[PDB]
Design a protein around this nucleic acid. Structure first.
Ligand SMILES: NC[C@@H]1O[C@H](O[C@H]2[C@@H](O)[C@H](O[C@@H]3[C@@H](O)[C@H](N)C[C@H](N)[C@H]3O[C@H]3O[C@H](CO)[C@@H](O)[C@H](O)[C@H]3N)O[C@@H]2CO)[C@H](N)[C@@H](O)[C@@H]1O
Ligand SMILES: NC[C@@H]1O[C@H](O[C@H]2[C@@H](O)[C@H](O[C@@H]3[C@@H](O)[C@H](N)C[C@H](N)[C@H]3O[C@H]3O[C@H](CO)[C@@H](O)[C@H](O)[C@H]3N)O[C@@H]2CO)[C@H](N)[C@@H](O)[C@@H]1O
Ligand SMILES: [K+]
Ligand SMILES: [K+]
Ligand SMILES: [K+]
Ligand SMILES: [Mg+2]
Ligand SMILES: [Mg+2]
Ligand SMILES: [Mg+2]
Ligand SMILES: [Mg+2]
Ligand SMILES: [Mg+2]
Ligand SMILES: [Mg+2]
Ligand SMILES: [Mg+2]
Ligand SMILES: [Mg+2]
Ligand SMILES: [Mg+2]
Ligand SMILES: [Mg+2]
Ligand SMILES: [Mg+2]
Ligand SMILES: [Mg+2]
Ligand SMILES: [Mg+2]
Ligand SMILES: [Mg+2]
Ligand SMILES: [Mg+2]
Ligand SMILES: [Mg+2]
Ligand SMILES: [Mg+2]
Ligand SMILES: [Mg+2]
Ligand SMILES: [Mg+2]
Ligand SMILES: [Mg+2]
Ligand SMILES: [Mg+2]
Ligand SMILES: [Mg+2]
Ligand SMILES: [Mg+2]
Ligand SMILES: [Mg+2]
Ligand SMILES: [Mg+2]
Ligand SMILES: [Mg+2]
Ligand SMILES: [Mg+2]
Ligand SMILES: [Mg+2]
Ligand SMILES: [Mg+2]
Ligand SMILES: [Mg+2]
Ligand SMILES: [Mg+2]
Ligand SMILES: [Mg+2]
Ligand SMILES: [Mg+2]
Ligand SMILES: [Mg+2]
Ligand SMILES: [Mg+2]
Ligand SMILES: [Mg+2]
Ligand SMILES: [Mg+2]
Ligand SMILES: [Mg+2]
Ligand SMILES: [Mg+2]
Ligand SMILES: [Mg+2]
Ligand SMILES: [Mg+2]
Ligand SMILES: [Mg+2]
Ligand SMILES: [Mg+2]
Ligand SMILES: [Mg+2]
Ligand SMILES: [Mg+2]
Ligand SMILES: [Mg+2]
Ligand SMILES: [Mg+2]
Ligand SMILES: [Mg+2]
Ligand SMILES: [Mg+2]
Ligand SMILES: [Mg+2]
Ligand SMILES: [Mg+2]
Ligand SMILES: [Mg+2]
Lengths: 101, 88, 119, 73
RNA sequence: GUGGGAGAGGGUGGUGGAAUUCCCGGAGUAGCGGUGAAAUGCGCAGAUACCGGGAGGAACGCCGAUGGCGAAGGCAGCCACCUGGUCCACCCGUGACGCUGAGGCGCGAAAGCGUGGGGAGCAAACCGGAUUAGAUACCCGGGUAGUCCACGCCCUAAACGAUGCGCGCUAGGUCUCUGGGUCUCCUGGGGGCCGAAGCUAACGCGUUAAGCGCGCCGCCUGGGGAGUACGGCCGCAAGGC
């Protein structure tokens, strides 16, 4: 049981329906792999520094979660199945390291 | 890995008395836990040698401690082996 | 015959030759020149003067399509790079900007022995 | 000798391990997409070593460029 | 033991962008390439240069260093999982349980070998072009094994600090990585430089000793013949000891 952070970048062109469906599958797969959600930050569409999947922008999701370590990899795989999901990055959470303090 | 609760479980299990973290029995026990963990890690990942060195060093340490116990108090030695189930 | 009137100028420079490709804003080429297009044949293509002649030639060929303002793109490290630049600067063409696009790998491929003591 | 400014002294209170914050990290990148040296950043060994990893993390997400085109010249 | 720390230490899976080559499309024309100078070569079946899309293989730019880790070989994009080593603080626990280590066992760059796969770039052999008195070379155009992956062999090296391991003692100055602390500074571990005493044939070494000592292992005994011959062991072979 460790605390991670899930970054997901998906298609910015999504209408509210398809978007809702993608997030539904995200929550679904999450509960399937047993990840408790501590909080969520939806940053929406932002302008990428380089083209990803030929599209100049992307829609962002950030989930701070806690899940059994053993299945984390096995989770990420699933999250990459959907065509609409172009980026997945899972990071072990870390205490913030301040500079110039 | 090896969580603190497991460590305390085995320590309290093999402790000669309350508060004893350092006795030969405790050390051999802890080492044995580590050794088993590592070997089960090495049934897969058999191509990882750097860790296998670690396994060698731990094994050696355990053998030396057990030898010491064997010298001082053969009763506690046989007891230790019996509870741990070493020597094969 | 298009009448583009604004476009890009690519400069490919190496210690051997310098060649200039003038394109529309989409990157599709219009005309081009080089040290070989001018009467130079051998090593003389690496000349700064060669590069000047080339740049000027491509520019004059671009006047024929009636072009005025261009963007310059520099690739390669070789002689006569800045000479081709200066050439284009006033050819009668207006130079809107200069950029060095020279591709540098993140070290993918093993260089030839000539270029080695690197990766 | 980079006597213009040190990126640290030109900045306020901030978190180095945060890969999602662009408007700060961008200051640590050159005219090109390259990570600045200790001379320019004015960071320390530990700090710089963390900064690198967070920058790369941001790059992969698409928040920061791997490389850029050089203006002027 | 408890609590903290740093790290390219190792194994498995996944993944990101730059570049090269090939393919597809657009646009576009007489050459590109390469050298001291050239030629072979490629190009009117449209090459070079430019934009767009795709496939594949290999290596990870900046960070990056005189830096870090590892017993050595060696280790560098990013993420996750498994896992080794190590340092500091507290003075908690055991109570000499230690050091070394013939033989044994395991690890061991590159090249090389076996089976299967893969093959973008590079490239022994080889095919050409030049140079040259010749050129079985340097330079140029190609190119097979190989380089890459899995499994199994091989056991070498300028495998280098040309400095076996451990412990104790013997001025300091300075730079640096990483902890702790009354945080000008003190204290501890690691990496560098200059230097006290001392040592050394000299160069140099000098708290990271090549100084002063103790323990244990390995090794040397003039050069060539020769790391050859014979024997033995090991190896599919090359060959190794
Ligand atoms: N090679 C793993 C690396 O682990 C890093 O993180 C490593 C360190 O930060 C961390 O240190 C741990 C920690 O609990 C704390 N600092 C003290 C502890 N003794 C350490 O654990 C250590 O000892 C144990 C055996 O006892 C080993 O199993 C383990 O590998 C080692 N890190 O343990 C981690 C695993 O070794 C980073 N993720 C990255 O550099 C990389 O993935
Ligand atoms: N970066 C992946 C690495 O893969 C290693 O092992 C992987 C690679 O060594 C090996 O090569 C695979 C190849 O099988 C497969 N047919 C194609 C694939 N593109 C390759 O993967 C890798 O190839 C090389 C490294 O050799 C890299 O240059 C490349 O970026 C990477 N994609 O395939 C293995 C997995 O099947 C280790 N797990 C670890 O170093 C790391 O995760
Ligand atoms: K010709
Ligand atoms: K070093
Ligand atoms: K002297
Ligand atoms: Mg997908
Ligand atoms: Mg030992
Ligand atoms: Mg030429
Ligand atoms: Mg690592
Ligand atoms: Mg590509
Ligand atoms: Mg074509
Ligand atoms: Mg050719
Ligand atoms: Mg060819
Ligand atoms: Mg022809
Ligand atoms: Mg021909
Ligand atoms: Mg024709
Ligand atoms: Mg054809
Ligand atoms: Mg091409
Ligand atoms: Mg392309
Ligand atoms: Mg292919
Ligand atoms: Mg560097
Ligand atoms: Mg070292
Ligand atoms: Mg070395
Ligand atoms: Mg005490
Ligand atoms: Mg007592
Ligand atoms: Mg030993
Ligand atoms: Mg031995
Ligand atoms: Mg070997
Ligand atoms: Mg090899
Ligand atoms: Mg082979
Ligand atoms: Mg084969
Ligand atoms: Mg070649
Ligand atoms: Mg060749
Ligand atoms: Mg030849
Ligand atoms: Mg001669
Ligand atoms: Mg063969
Ligand atoms: Mg050396
Ligand atoms: Mg050394
Ligand atoms: Mg040294
Ligand atoms: Mg000698
Ligand atoms: Mg020494
Ligand atoms: Mg020895
Ligand atoms: Mg020891
Ligand atoms: Mg020191
Ligand atoms: Mg070192
Ligand atoms: Mg000195
Ligand atoms: Mg003296
Ligand atoms: Mg002297
Ligand atoms: Mg000493
Ligand atoms: Mg000998
Ligand atoms: Mg003799
Ligand atoms: Mg001899
Ligand atoms: Mg020999
Ligand atoms: Mg004999
Ligand atoms: Mg014999
Ligand atoms: Mg035989
Ligand atoms: Mg032979």
């Amino acid at each position: 049981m460790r605390r991670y952070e899930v970054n997901i970048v998906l298609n910015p062109n999504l209408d509210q329906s398809q978007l809702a469906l993608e997030k539904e599958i995200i929550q679904r797969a999450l509960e399937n792999y047993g990840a408790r959600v501590e909080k969520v930050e939806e940053l929406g569409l932002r302008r990428l520094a380089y083209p990803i999947a030929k599209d100049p922008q992307g829609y962002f999701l950030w989930y701070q979660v806690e899940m059994p370590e053993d299945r984390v990899n096995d989770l990420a795989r699933e999250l990459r199945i959907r065509d609409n999901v172009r980026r997945v990055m899972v990071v072990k959470s870390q205490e913030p390291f301040l500079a110039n303090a | 890995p090896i969580t603190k609760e497991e460590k305390q479980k085995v320590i309290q299990e093999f402790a000669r008395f309350p508060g004893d973290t350092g006795s030969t029995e405790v050390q051999v026990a802890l080492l044995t836990l580590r050794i088993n963990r590592l070997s089960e890690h090495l049934k897969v990942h058999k191509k990882d040698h750097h860790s296998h060195r670690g396994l060698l060093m731990m094994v050696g340490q355990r053998r030396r401690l057990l030898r010491y116990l064997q010298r001082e108090d053969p009763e506690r030695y046989r007891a230790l082996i019996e509870k741990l189930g070493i020597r094969g | 015959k298009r009448q583009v009137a604004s476009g890009r100028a690519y400069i490919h420079a190496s210690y051997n030759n310098t060649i200039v490709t003038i394109t529309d804003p989409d990157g599709n080429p219009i005309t081009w020149s080089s040290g070989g297009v001018i009467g130079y044949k051998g090593s003389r293509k690496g000349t700064p003067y060669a590069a000047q002649l080339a740049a000027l030639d491509a520019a004059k060929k671009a006047m024929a399509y009636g072009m005025q303002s261009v963007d310059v793109i520099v690739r390669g490290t070789g002689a006569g790079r800045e000479q081709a630049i200066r050439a284009l600067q006033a050819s009668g063409l207006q130079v809107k900007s200069i950029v060095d696009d020279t591709p540098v790998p993140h070290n993918g491929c093993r260089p030839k022995k000539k270029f080695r003591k690197a990766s | 000798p980079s006597r213009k400014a040190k990126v640290k002294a030109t900045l306020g209170e901030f978190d180095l391990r945060d890969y999602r914050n662009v408007e700060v990290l961008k200051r640590f990148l050159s005219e090109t997409g390259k990570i600045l040296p200790r001379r320019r950043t004015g960071l320390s060994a530990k700090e710089q070593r963390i900064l690198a990893k967070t920058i790369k993390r941001a790059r992969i997400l698409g928040l920061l460029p791997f490389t850029e085109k050089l203006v002027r010249k």
